[PDB]
Design a binder for this molecule. Structure first.
Ligand code: NA
Ligand SMILES: [Zn+2]
Ligand SMILES: [Zn+2]
Ligand SMILES: [Zn+2]
Length: 231
């Protein structure tokens, strides 16, 4: 029942309820003549919402805000981007113009600026060292170490046992490396083990792209990363 890359035209966004007050958002983009899905998260925060990641571009992100107001009807007051790539920050300008306070680590803000990408306004402190965690409203933010990117964060929703791995975690159907231009392949397995150690009770694990599953997605990602390392 999770929407697949094939059922979502580029420009539209779907919401999927994972648990009480926790949704993923799913959008698509075309690259090199193929179509790719991308996930983010929405977490209820009293009578407001916390958004995790944009919907991969300005147009998709405007559609995301429209779909949230239609389906949920609570204001998105804050957004966190989990690393500096466009599937995470592309759409930050749309969020900002809509009155959403945008956040990322100082590492992410720096890398976004270097890349010429959109830059979240606010800096998240306390996430500079591997293993660092901070509470941000209804979620915990965790910096596991370098993996898919040097700045990648993961997000845990303790009330729902939902772990949002972002692009540091691959879906099961992905058996080859994705975009690894900015990755730390040498550290990625160690960073994954920090995630496993910190969130062993997670019941629902969401990758940056593709289908959710359980904690098996972590060892799966390590397997794929190690195979790529040995290519
Ligand atoms: Na924790
Ligand atoms: Zn990325
Ligand atoms: Zn502000
Ligand atoms: Zn990604």
């Amino acid at each position: 029942e999770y929407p697949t890359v094939s059922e979502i035209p580029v420009g539209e966004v779907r919401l999927y309820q994972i648990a009480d007050g926790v949704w993923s958002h799913i959008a698509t983009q075309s690259f090199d003549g193929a179509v790719y899905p991308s996930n983010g998260l929405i977490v209820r925060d009293g009578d407001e919402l916390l958004l995790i990641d944009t919907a991969w571009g300005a147009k998709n992100t405007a559609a995301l805000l429209a779909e949230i107001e239609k389906q949920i009807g609570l204001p998105v007051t804050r957004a966190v981007s989990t690393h500096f790539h466009d599937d995470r920050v592309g759409g930050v300008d749309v969020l900002r113009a809509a009155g959403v306070a945008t956040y990322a680590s100082p590492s992410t803000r720096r890398l976004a600026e270097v890349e010429g990408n959109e830059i979240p306004t606010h800096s998240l402190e306390g996430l500079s060292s591997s293993g660092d965690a901070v509470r941000f409203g209804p979620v915990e933010l965790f910096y596991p170490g370098a993996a898919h990117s040097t700045d990648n964060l993961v997000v845990y929703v303790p009330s729902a046992s939902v772990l949002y791995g972002g692009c540091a975690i691959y879906e099961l159907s992905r058996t080859s490396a994705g975009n690894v231009a900015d990755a730390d392949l040498a550290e990625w397995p160690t960073s994954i083990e920090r995630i496993q150690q910190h969130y062993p009770e997670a019941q629902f694990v969401i990758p940056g792209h593709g289908l959710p599953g359980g904690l098996d997605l972590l060892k799966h990602t390590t397997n794929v990363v190690k195979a790529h390392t040995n290519r």
